[PDB]
Amino acid sequence: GNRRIRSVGEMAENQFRVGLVRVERAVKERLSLGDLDTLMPQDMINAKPI
Amino acid sequence: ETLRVDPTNDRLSALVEIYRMMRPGEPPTREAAESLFENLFFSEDRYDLS
Amino acid sequence: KKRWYVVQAFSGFEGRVATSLREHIKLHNMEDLFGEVMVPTEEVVEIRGGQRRKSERKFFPGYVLVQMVMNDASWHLVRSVPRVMGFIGGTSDRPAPISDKEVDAIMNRLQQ
Amino acid sequence: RERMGHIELASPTAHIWFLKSLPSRIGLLLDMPLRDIERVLYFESYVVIEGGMTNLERQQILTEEQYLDALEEFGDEFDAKMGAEAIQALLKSMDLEQ
DNA sequence: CCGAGCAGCTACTTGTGAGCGGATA
DNA sequence: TATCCGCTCACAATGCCACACGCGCTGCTCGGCC
RNA sequence: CACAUUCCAACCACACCUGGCGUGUGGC
């Protein structure tokens, strides 16, 4: 009752979040200069970390 | 006993003392230190009780 | 007084950290407390020759020393922006700035 | 297999084994607490040398403020170096029999 | 500009012994 | 001022064997008397 | 004149290969 079991799904979601926080910091520092009418919501995101 | 061993009395000195306990040195003001205490235990980005 | 404190950043990201701290200063409208980046990478040393004569605006240690007024809010602002791993200075956390002699020295390095 | 070279370090540095032995050699030899020697080693404080006519103790340590406020008292004979070079000068200026 | 090598993107052990304050007579 | 007590840090925790696998991408910096 | 070596019928010399380190698993 005090020991919890985690499956592959929970670990995968955890690692997805670990990558997502890095991509979040990246998109936040990239949004510091992006203005209106200059970029589509595609270039600010990279595949690398996640 | 925990009260008579408490060095600080008000809320602001408590915050700066707990900040010094968390981070070595870096002595802020009361408002600057409170950011840590409010971001570590009561922010949904660094505390994720499922 | 706007003193010239020294700050270290991530290896290579010196100019990027400089522009990030400038955008942070322009963000919280705290220009009355800071000066400019004073990026000391004035090392136009280049290699010229056959179809390749570009310049190198690099070749300097990773130091982005910034002119600013030392304060709690100023320090917390320049530390809140990431990639600021190095805040040089012998102190607990409140260091002493550089003197005017080294100021003129780095100014001469800027002019040369 | 046997021929070796060397590196001429521009700044003489301390040997971490003799500084983190617990008890460290310099910590007992230089009759100075290991905390202050570590403070001098990582360049966050000063240690004075060749006191002589100054009011300070020759082996005493100082911070940056403790150095700037005391520099105006003596600037010619009072000197406080701040790097493994300081403890090297301490070693070289130490007598064994005395 | 070209090529070559290298950097950013933690806590259920417990026990033993030694050392460094520290507070009490 | 001596001296026991409490907090902190270094060091240790078989042995063998067998198999399998791994150190990336973008980015940054240094390389050079014919 | 002197010091110092002499570059070519079989063949001697020109050989032979990843525990750097970590992780995972299994056995005794």
Concatenate the DSSP letters of all residues of B2-38 into one string: TTTT----SHHHHHHHHHHHHSSS----HHHHHHHHH
* Residue for token pair 């000068």: D89
B19, two tokens: 């900040």
**Opening angle at CA B14, ends B11 and B20, nearest 5:** 145
Q: CA B3, CA B19: separation in Å to the nearest integer? A: 19
3-state secondary structure of C112: coil
Query: Residue A12 CA to F22 C1' — how many Å?
Result: 21
What gap in Å lies between CA D82 and CA D38, rounded to an integer? 11
Let me know: does C41 contact C63? Beta carbons within 8 Å: no
Sign of CA dihedral C14, C19, C23, C26: positive
- What is the C-alpha to C-alpha distance for residues C64 and C101, in angstroms, rounded to an integer? 18
At A38 the three-state DSSP class reads coil
CA distances from C25 to A27, B20, B21, C76, D30 (A): 20, 26, 29, 12, 48
Question: What SS3 class is residue D49?
Answer: strand
State how far the Cα of C63 lies from the Cα of C8, in Å rounded to an integer. Answer: 5
Helices C14-27 and C72-80, axial angle in degrees (round to 10): 130
Find, in chain B, the residue whose alpha carbon is nearest to that of C77.
Answer: B32
In angstroms, the CA D62 to CA D83 distance is 13
- Other Cβ atoms less than 10 A from the Cβ of D8: the count is 4
User: Which SS3 state, helix, strand or coil, does residue C4 take?
Assistant: strand
Q: Work out the angle between the directed axes of helices C72-80 and B30-40 (0-180°, nearest 10).
A: 30
CATH code for the domain defined by C1-112: 3.30.70.940
* Residue C34: closest CA among C7, C63, C62: C7
> What is the DSSP track for C21-90?
HHHHHHHTT-TTTB---------------TT-----S--S-SB--EEE---HHHHHHHHHSSS--B--SS
Do D62 and D54 form a contact (C-beta atoms < 8 A)?
A: no
Q: CB distance B32–C92 less than 8 Å? A: no
**What is the rounded CA–CA span in Å between residue C44 and residue C65?**
19
Is the distance from CB of C93 to CB of B27 less than 8 angstroms? yes
For residue C75, give both structure tokens: 């320090």
Q: In chain C, which residues have their Cβ closer than 8 Å to the Cβ of B26?
A: 93
What's the DSSP call for residue C5? E
Which residue does chain C place closest to D41, by CA atoms?
A: C90
Residue nearest to nucleotide F27 (CA to C1'): C12
Q: Which of C39, C59, C60 is nearest to C47 (CA)?
A: C59
Chains that touch A (3 or more CB pairs under 8 A): C
Most distant CA pair in chain A, distance: 55
CA angle B45/B28/C65 to nearest 5° reads 95
Query: Distance of CA B22 to CAs B7, B25, B37, C72, C85, Å?
Result: 16, 9, 10, 18, 18
Of C28, C21, C29, the C-alpha closest to C87 is C21
C67: which strand partners? C4
Residue A16: its H or E element: helix A8-30
Provide the shortest C-alpha distance from residue C94 to chain B (in Å). Answer: 8
Task: In whole angstroms, give the CA distance from residue C79 to residue D44.
Answer: 19
Q: Does A25 touch chain C (CB under 8 A)?
A: yes
R_g over Cα of chain A: 16
Task: Return the DSSP state at A47.
Answer: S
Which burial class, exposed, middle or buried, applies to B10 when counting CB atoms under 10 A from its CB (0-12, 13-18, 19+)?
exposed
Contact status of B36 with chain C (Cβ, < 8 Å): no
Interface check D44 vs C, CB under 8 A: yes
Q: Closest Cα to residue D78, out of D45, D54, D44, D47?
A: D54
Contact at 8 Å (CB) between C98 and C6? Answer: yes
- Which residue type sits at A22? R
Query: Which residue of chain C is at minimal alpha-carbon distance from B24?
Result: C92
Question: Measured between CA atoms, how close is B3 to chain C, in angstroms?
Answer: 29
Distance, Å, D35 CA → E21 C1': 12
Q: Strand F closer than 7 Å to the CB of C13?
A: yes
Chain A residues within an 8 Å CB radius of C23: 32-33
State the nearest Cα–Cα gap between C72 and chain B, in angstroms: 6
Q: Which 25-84 positions of C have CB less than 7 A from strand F? A: 47, 58-59, 62
> Phi and psi dihedrals of C17, rounded to 5?
-65, -35
Distance CA C62, CA A20 (A): 29
d(CA B8, CA B30): 13
C11 touches strand F (CB under 7 A): yes
The helix (H) or strand (E) run that includes residue D46 is strand D46-47
Which method was it determined by? cryo-EM
CB C33, CB C69: distance < 8 Å: yes
Q: Is A35 on the interface with C (CB under 8 A)?
A: no
For the beta carbon of residue C36, count every other beta carbon within 10 angstroms.
13
- For C98, half-sphere exposure in the C-beta direction (CA atoms, 13 angstrom radius) is 18
Eight-state DSSP code of residue C8:
B
Contact indicator for A44, A31 with CB cutoff of 8 Å: yes
B26 touches C93 (CB < 8 A)? yes
Q: Do chains C and A touch (3 or more CB pairs under 8 A)?
A: yes
